[PDB]
From a paper:
In Staphylococcus aureus, an opportunistic pathogen, macrolide resistance is primarily mediated by Erm-family methyltransferases, which mono- or dimethylate A2058 in the 23S ribosomal RNA, reducing drug binding. Using cryo-electron microscopy, we determined the high-resolution structures of solithromycin-bound ribosomes, including those with dimethylated A2058. Our focus is on solithromycin (SOL), a bactericidal fourth-generation macrolide, because of its enhanced ribosomal binding properties. Our study demonstrates that SOL can bind to the ribosome both in unmodified and in double-methylated states.
Hence, we determined the cryo-EM structure of the ribosome–SOL complex from MNY196, which features both hyperproduced and hyperactive ErmB. The data were collected and processed under conditions similar to those of SA_KES34_SOL, yielding a 2.15 Å cryo-EM reconstruction of the 70S ribosome. Multibody refinement focused on the large subunit revealed at 2.08 Å resolution that the antibiotic can be accommodated into the ribosome at high concentrations and bind its pocket, despite the double methylation of A2058. Importantly, the density corresponding to the two methyl groups of A2058 is clearly resolved, confirming their presence and suggesting that they contribute to the subtle displacement of the coordinating water molecule. The density of the antibiotic is also clearly defined, indicating stable binding within the ribosome. Comparative analysis of the NPET using the PoseEdit 2D interaction maps shows that SOL establishes a nearly identical contact network in the unmethylated (SA_KES34_SOL) and dimethylated (SA_MNY196_SOL) ribosomes: the main difference is the loss of a water-mediated hydrogen bond to A2058 when the nucleotide is dimethylated, owing to a 1.1 Å shift of the water molecule. Despite this change, critical stabilizing interactions are retained, such as those in the proximity of the fluorine atom to C2611 and the aromatic–aromatic (π–π) interaction with the A752:U2609 base pair. These interactions appear sufficient to stabilize SOL within the binding site, even in the presence of a dimethylated A2058. The direct hydrogen bond between the desosamine group of SOL and the N1 of A2058 elongates from 2.75 Å in the unmethylated state to > 3 Å in the dimethylated state, indicating a weaker interaction. In SA_MNY196_SOL, the strong SOL density in the cryo-EM map suggests that SOL binds directly to the dimethylated ribosome rather than selectively interacting with a subpopulation of unmethylated or partially methylated ribosomes as suggested by Chen et al (2023) relating to TEL binding.
Author numbering:
A (entry chain 2): 2 to 45
B (entry chain C): 2 to 275
The structure:
RNA sequence: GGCCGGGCCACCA
RNA sequence: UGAUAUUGAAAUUCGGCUUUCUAACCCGCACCACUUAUCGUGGUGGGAGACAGUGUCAGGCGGGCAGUUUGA
RNA sequence: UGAGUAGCGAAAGACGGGUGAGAAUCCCGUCCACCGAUUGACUAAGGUUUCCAGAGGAAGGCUCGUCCGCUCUGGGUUAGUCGGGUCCUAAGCUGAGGCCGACAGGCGUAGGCGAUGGAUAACAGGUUGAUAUUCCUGUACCACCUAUAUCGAUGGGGGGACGCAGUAGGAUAGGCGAAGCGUGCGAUUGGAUGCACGUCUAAGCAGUAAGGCUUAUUGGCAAAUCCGGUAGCUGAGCUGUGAUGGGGAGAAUUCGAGUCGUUGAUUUCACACUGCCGAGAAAAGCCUCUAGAAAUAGGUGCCCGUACCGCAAACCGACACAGGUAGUCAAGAUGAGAAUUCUAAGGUGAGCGAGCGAACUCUCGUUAAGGAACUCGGCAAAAUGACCCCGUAACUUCGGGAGAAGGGGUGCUCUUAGAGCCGCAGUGAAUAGGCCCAAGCGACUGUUUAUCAAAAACACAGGUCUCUGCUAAACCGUAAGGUGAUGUAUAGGGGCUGACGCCUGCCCGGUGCUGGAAGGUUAAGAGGAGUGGUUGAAGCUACGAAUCGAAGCCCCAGUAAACGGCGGCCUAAGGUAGCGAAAUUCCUUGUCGGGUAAGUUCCGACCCGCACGAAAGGCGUAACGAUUUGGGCACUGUCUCAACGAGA
RNA sequence: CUACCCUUGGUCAGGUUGAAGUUCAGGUAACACUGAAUGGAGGACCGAACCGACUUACGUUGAAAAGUGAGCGGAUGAACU
RNA sequence: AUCCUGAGUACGACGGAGCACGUGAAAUUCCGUCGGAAUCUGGGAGGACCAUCUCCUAAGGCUAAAUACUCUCUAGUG
């Protein structure tokens, strides 16, 4: 049966990518939180 | 006239349609078309704000000359055409200088007939004049509310209004709804009645034919749940169960008037209707 | 309780 | 829905009422320019006009929505 | 611990030979078997090295393992023309200025980004362990540059440029046949001398082509010789060349033939033509107008992707998981068919086996006599079934019902519809409607509780009420800005009803809605008579009645396809038509009749309607239904009543 | 994923039925009207692909956190993708 | 004390907020709306308010230190 995750490079980059995060204040808050926690990966 | 289909199927039973015998040309005029993507009742927020809109056939917009501001030049009617965007047919008119325009097709307008607009135009069907120069008792359509803005009243199939009198800078008109109101004397109107009178006679016949027109199904409030509608809930079928029938947004919806107060047009509306 | 001829208004031991 | 501010000039009639005016304010009206632009701003006409809209105050309606109560 | 227990994930393997310390499990061979509108071939997404070679066998692999999509080491993806960028726009996103907003921000103009669409120059053959329209060979094309002898729009106009169905044709691909020509083979099982295949070759460049379509003067911001007004272009395919090249059934690097018939597209001409209503993108490339201001030869041509899996062992499902995953190619026999069965191309034998042939479970086949007696219920199974020809009821909205029902035929051989031949049986396998009578509900096709409900529920076409005069009403939003609508009362929103037919009664007292009267009542505000405190007073200060003062509410009227109500003298009025033990009836298995040997269910009546009733519609109604309910024929292991056989 | 929607693409073996129109032959003062032919309409019929999910059997420490087998509904449309 | 000394200001009504303080005998501070002074014989406060007395001189601005914290750095401690 069809499952929830149907991968799509373009969709993934456009919704969760770096530039989409930079595009809003709350996305920049996400990036700041992840930098503060010390994550290796900040976004897609 | 109206075509009555034979009941070859349960869907075709009692279905009728226009025969399109007044349509003299079956394709539009290319230079006057414009794209018209569907909104499906969704506004600039992307949110549905009007229910029951969506789907339906693809349509191209026909640019219609509602203003009729090309004064002093004759125009010959070249063809009567189907317009998917409105109930009336439209007429392609060719001006004496070669300019081609679309106008609402009046009842009785014929190919080869000459229409003209302006203060000096004759009182004949398809001619557009200011209300100042239109005699009392004349049946008109495509009436402007503001000078130069273009006709806004009496534009659908079979629509008409009659001139009643002249009181100063306003002209008294009885509209198709039955309302009697004043309109500025410099506002233009076109002589005659809008054509395609049989438009309201069509028996749609089946649900799918409504779907082709972009109408999505209406769900009654009585079969919703209380969190969806004031009429929702109850065990089994239920009556209204409150003093007044209600809209889905919680407002009385049988007889309650909604015209707002203190409008600038109150002074201009002499007798109302609907 | 207020006011007017029962009706409107008012009432935070 | 009322008062008041924005809000100005004349009259008629009984602190008001009414009518007229234009110049505030308004126009999802027309044309013009910026400008290859159905936004905007400015200009000129037209319409409307001390109304409307908006602020503050006040009365009314208000399961549309909300916080809760509904004893032993 | 349970326990050496459950399981080891859809299936056909056998043997020989090899390798090895070790082999059902690896390699090779032969035979057998499975898929084949696909278990074959090729694209896309997604994955991201899983690809190739050599070496390995700790762990992973549901067993084994010498093997591997696992481990180690070394390798592998080649483009002016393929797909994308240096081209175009759609939805949508964004947005200089701008509009709006406690902040944060929201919206939006020009503009921009953005394919799933438009434009756009390369084909055939060969070659590797792993790449190929990319490398090589052959033959091309496109853009730009140079060398040797009118151009014109970030302007106008045209064009690009478009739905759905159906029909008749042209051509071609492909299929089949004869063997015309060629290439192999001619067989120790009784016979014959016949059996088995091949029959190709691109872009490009020339030529050809069935077909298909069809002069003057004066608004497109200035001008136009263009467009608008007025008084020939396209086109599948063919032929030659490309190519004495290449490939070839085969034979010994050399040689080796490319034809006749038939059928004929789902491909193409081509959305060409015809018809229809629901009326079917944009922009650039391109052509042209105006303002305005050659061939030939040689050379140059960038970036990104390119391995491999890809209807899966590599993607989504935690798995080497019976699931999910867009498009394309579409052989033969049979047939209407892409159904069915067997095959071709090509792929595959399923990552535990060996025995045995107990109970019991599951899947499958048969069954004496009977034939629904089973059971809540014929649940399941059985029966029906294709094609051709007869024949076909009530009812009906005249379409239908209808494939009603019910019958008949079918093999093979020969002769020109007959004559024969064989079997138990001839659509001899596989696949292919069970039907009829009656009632309830809903008109109908459709929709629904992803994952216990598919329905009588929702929707629906139709009806009616109501709102709405356009900056409409309604709706989203604080606003700006939007939807409604580039619509305008034959339109748009909301309520209820639910095809159609015949109809839809009584009550406006109450509530809601609509309109009237400005009589009573009321707030802010105005208006200030008067009074207290303090300083005989002003004065400062705390309060304070006349009266003016809106809507609402009270009052009056109307309105029931508004909310509602439809008696037991009382009311506002006391239920019309139709229907009725009903999807409604407690008593109740009401009573009577029909149907059965027997009928709490069913059908027809009665009316005593606990507690039907007219758009939360009444009563009917052809057609329709994986709906509910009763009856009947067929048929059967459902049952009497169980028996045997096959496999897991 | 799922619901609705927007833009732009794609897909639907075969068989059956036979609406409107048109032509002819009648018929008529004219028009109705009749018969044949043709024509090819439909949320039309049967039925693969495809989309569903009515019954039943199996599965229920599953092959599968919703499936499989056998039938079953739709299958040019309010279709599916 | 001849002139100057912060005006839509102080202040008031209504609605709110901040003050320990819930509008209360509520002074004192601020905001919106509307109104709106006095001018050294002036003005403000001393918890309603008035008079006297006392203290001060709003409606312009600037100002170290004592105080708060530790991602850090240096040296140490339990
Ligand atoms: K119409
Ligand atoms: K490659
Ligand atoms: K009543
Ligand atoms: K009433
Ligand atoms: K009864
Ligand atoms: K009842
Ligand atoms: Mg609607
Ligand atoms: Mg509905
Ligand atoms: Mg419900
Ligand atoms: Mg509610
Ligand atoms: Mg209710
Ligand atoms: Mg009920
Ligand atoms: Mg008001
Ligand atoms: Mg509540
Ligand atoms: Mg709480
Ligand atoms: Mg208790
Ligand atoms: Mg154990
Ligand atoms: Mg054991
Ligand atoms: Mg045990
Ligand atoms: Mg055991
Ligand atoms: Mg076992
Ligand atoms: Mg296995
Ligand atoms: Mg087979
Ligand atoms: Mg490998
Ligand atoms: Mg192992
Ligand atoms: Mg490896
Ligand atoms: Mg924006
Ligand atoms: Mg702002
Ligand atoms: Mg593309
Ligand atoms: Mg390869
Ligand atoms: Mg077009
Ligand atoms: Mg054709
Ligand atoms: Mg085919
Ligand atoms: Mg078509
Ligand atoms: Mg490859
Ligand atoms: Mg693999
Ligand atoms: Mg396996
Ligand atoms: Mg799998
Ligand atoms: Mg799968
Ligand atoms: Mg076929
Ligand atoms: Mg098959
Ligand atoms: Mg038997
Ligand atoms: Mg027997
Ligand atoms: Mg029998
Ligand atoms: Mg029985
Ligand atoms: Mg029994
Ligand atoms: Mg059954
Ligand atoms: Mg058959
Ligand atoms: Mg026979
Ligand atoms: Mg139904
Ligand atoms: Mg159905
Ligand atoms: Mg369910
Ligand atoms: Mg349950
Ligand atoms: Mg179900
Ligand atoms: Mg709009
Ligand atoms: Mg209903
Ligand atoms: Mg009903
Ligand atoms: Mg009634
Ligand atoms: Mg009344
Ligand atoms: Mg009042
Ligand atoms: Mg008052
Ligand atoms: Mg009872
Ligand atoms: Mg019986
Ligand atoms: Mg009965
Ligand atoms: Mg009822
Ligand atoms: Mg009713
Ligand atoms: Mg049976
Ligand atoms: Mg296909
Ligand atoms: Mg159908
Ligand atoms: Mg699929
Ligand atoms: Mg479903
Ligand atoms: Mg199935
Ligand atoms: Mg059916
Ligand atoms: Mg079907
Ligand atoms: Mg000072
Ligand atoms: Mg406070
Ligand atoms: Mg204070
Ligand atoms: Mg205080
Ligand atoms: Mg003070």
């Amino acid at each position: 049966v069809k499952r929830t995750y149907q991968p799509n490079k373009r969709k993934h980059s456009k919704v969760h990518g770096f530039r989409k995060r930079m595009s809003t204040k709350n996305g920049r808050k996400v990036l700041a939180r992840r930098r503060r926690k010390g994550r290796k990966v900040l976004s897609a | 006239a109206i075509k009555k289909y034979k009941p070859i199927t349960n869907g075709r039973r009692n279905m009728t349609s226009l025969d399109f015998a007044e349509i003299t040309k079956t394709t539009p005029e290319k230079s006057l078309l414009k794209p018209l993507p569907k909104k499906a009742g969704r506004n600039n927020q992307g949110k549905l704000t009007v229910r029951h809109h969506g789907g339906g056939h693809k349509r191209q917009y026909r640019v219609i000359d509602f203003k009729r501001n090309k004064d002093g030049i004759n125009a010959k009617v070249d063809s009567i055409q189907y317009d998917p965007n409105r109930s009336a047919n439209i007429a392609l008119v060719v001006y004496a200088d070669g300019e081609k325009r679309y106008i609402i097709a009046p009842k009785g307008l014929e190919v080869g007939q000459i229409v003209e607009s302006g203060a000096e135009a004759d009182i004949k069907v398809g001619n557009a004049l200011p209300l100042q120069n239109i005699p009392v008792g004349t049946v008109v359509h495509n009436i402007e509310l503001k000078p130069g803005k273009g006709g806004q009243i009496a534009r659908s199939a079979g629509a008409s209004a009659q001139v009643l009198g002249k009181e100063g800078k306003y002209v008294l008109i009885r509209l198709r709804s039955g309302e009697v109101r004043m309109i500025l004397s410099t506002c233009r109107a076109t002589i005659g009645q809008v054509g395609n009178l049989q438009h309201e006679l069509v028996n749609v016949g089946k649900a799918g034919r409504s779907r082709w027109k972009g109408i999505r199904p209406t769900v009654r409030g009585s079969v919703m749940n209380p969190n969806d509608h004031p009429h929702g809930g109850g065990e089994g079928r239920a009556p209204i169960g409150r003093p007044s029938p209600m809209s889905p947004w919680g407002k009385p919806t049988l007889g309650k008037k909604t015209r707002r107060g203190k409008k600038s047009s109150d002074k201009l509306i002499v007798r109302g209707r609907k």
